[PDB]
Amino acid sequence: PRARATQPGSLGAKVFRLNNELPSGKTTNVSFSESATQKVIEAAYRQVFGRMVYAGQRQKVAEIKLENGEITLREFIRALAKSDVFRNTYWSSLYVTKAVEYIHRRLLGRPTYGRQEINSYFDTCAKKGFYALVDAIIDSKEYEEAF
């Protein structure tokens, strides 16, 4: 449980980090920084939604706030997951328990462990709703320790 944060090498999926922090005022034309930031935004779009979303549907306001550097990658993934296209795709078409399970597999990278964990997240879905479900998944200590 100390090694939740250790990334797998060549035996699992690759992990994308936003470590370069896209920093520039008076940026070079052939700056390599924006291109890697586009790679990371690409990666967040296809890990949250699964696929690259259609061209009219992607959020440009959260991409712009990330490339300017005011929000973190965690809050950017929270703004991707609390969007209308994500909830119309995954939360509004499905059963509530199946939506809890699939949103947990999308945002935490793993299926749920047991019943307490599902009785606690679907209670957050009960008294508060889907937005607090995304907020409680992104809050969790496994998310902060893993990513």
Binding site: S92, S93, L94, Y95, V96, T97, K98, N119, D123, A126
Partner: protein, 161 residues
Amino acid sequence: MQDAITSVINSADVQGKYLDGSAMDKLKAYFTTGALRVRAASTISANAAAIVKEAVAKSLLYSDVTRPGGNMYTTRRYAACIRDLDYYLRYATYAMLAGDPSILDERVLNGLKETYNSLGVPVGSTVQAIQAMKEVTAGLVGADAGREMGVYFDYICSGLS
């Protein structure tokens, strides 16, 4: 998830045809009943907790299921039961507003039987609880609004059984 309008449009689109007179008549029927649907939805949103607690007071209270050994015994199980009944009333209100029970089998009745069978939840006792909830809300909103609520309550009880 589709209301009466979206289902009419989906039928006319799967046909590939334009909206003929029968579709116009169906949409006129929905546009006449919609104000009654709105007022019944407001009246049900008024008294959510009262309808739920009167349904438990009619059916589930003072029976064996609230006694030791019952599935409604503990405070956790009581809170989850109130939570389940609030879900049934809320989604019956949604299906009343849409005029189509597609949300019920999309989002309530999808894995509900297998969940209740895995947990050990009695399906007959919760069907009686939903029936008492239907009886209370039909006493609340009147005859015809109670009937158009009870058709979706009977849909939930039929999909649960």
